[PDB]
C-alpha cells in the first residue's frame, strides 16, 4: 500500500557526523513538493533551509518499523550521550520571542 499518515521513516542528512544525524519521524502528508521538518529538529541535523536536501528511508517490515519506533524516534533520542545535554532545543524566532 501507499505511504500514509503515521508511517515510521528514517530521515537523514549528510554529512552523517553523529548518531543524531539519523533519527526517525512519523509521516504527515502536506500538499507541496518539500520535506517539512519541525524547526528545533534542525539543530541535531546541523541543517538549515538555504537549499539543504535531506534523505528519506522507509522500512517495510514490522520488526524494522518497531526498531525505529523504539530506538530512533525524535523524542526518545533528545538527550545525547555526547555531552549529557539535550541536543534538541528552542531556536530562532521561538527562542527570541519567548524572551
Amino acid at each position: 500500500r501507499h505511504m500514509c499518515d503515521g508511517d515510521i521513516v528514517i530521515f537523514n542528512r549528510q554529512p552523517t557526523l553523529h548518531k543524531m544525524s539519523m533519527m526517525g519521524h512519523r509521516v504527515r502528508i502536506l500538499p507541496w513538493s518539500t520535506f517539512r521538518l519541525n524547526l528545533s529538529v534542525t539543530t541535531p541535523y546541523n541543517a538549515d533551509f538555504d537549499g539543504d536536501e535531506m534523505n528519506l528511508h522507509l522500512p517495510q517490515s514490522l520488526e524494522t518499523r518497531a526498531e525505529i519506533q523504539e530506538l530512533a524516534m525524535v523524542p526518545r533520542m533528545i538527550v545525547t550521550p555526547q555531552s549529557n545535554r539535550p541536543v534538541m532545543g528552542i531556536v530562532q524566532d521561538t527562542l527570541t520571542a519567548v524572551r
Binding site: 517490515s61 514490522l62 520488526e63 518499523r65 518497531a66 526498531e67 519506533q69 523504539e70 530506538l71
Partner: protein
C-alpha cells in the same frame, strides 16, 4: 542461581521483542490480550508488553559461549 545478567529488559530487547511479536500477530498468531479497537499489530504488541503476557523467551549470550534463557514476563519493563 546461574543468572548473572541484568534483571532489566534493555531497550534493544524491547525493540526486537515488539518487532517479532508484531510480525507474528500480522501472521495471524493468537493474541494473548483482549482487543478493544486496534488494527495495526504494533499497538497490539505494546499492549501485550504492558500486559506482560507475551509468548517470548529471549536467550542472552554471555561473552564466553554460555547462554541465559530469560522470560519477557519475568523481566522488568521500562515503563
Amino acid at each position: 542461581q546461574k543468572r548473572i545478567t541484568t534483571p532489566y529488559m534493555t531497550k534493544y530487547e524491547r525493540a526486537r521483542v515488539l518487532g517479532t511479536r508484531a510480525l507474528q500477530i500480522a501472521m495471524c498468531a493468537p493474541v494473548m490480550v483482549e482487543l478493544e479497537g486496534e488494527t495495526d499489530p504494533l499497538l497490539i504488541a505494546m499492549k501485550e508488553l504492558k500486559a506482560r503476557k507475551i509468548p517470548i523467551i529471549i536467550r542472552r549470550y554471555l561473552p564466553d559461549g554460555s547462554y541465559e534463557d530469560w522470560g519477557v514476563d519475568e523481566l522488568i519493563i521500562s515503563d
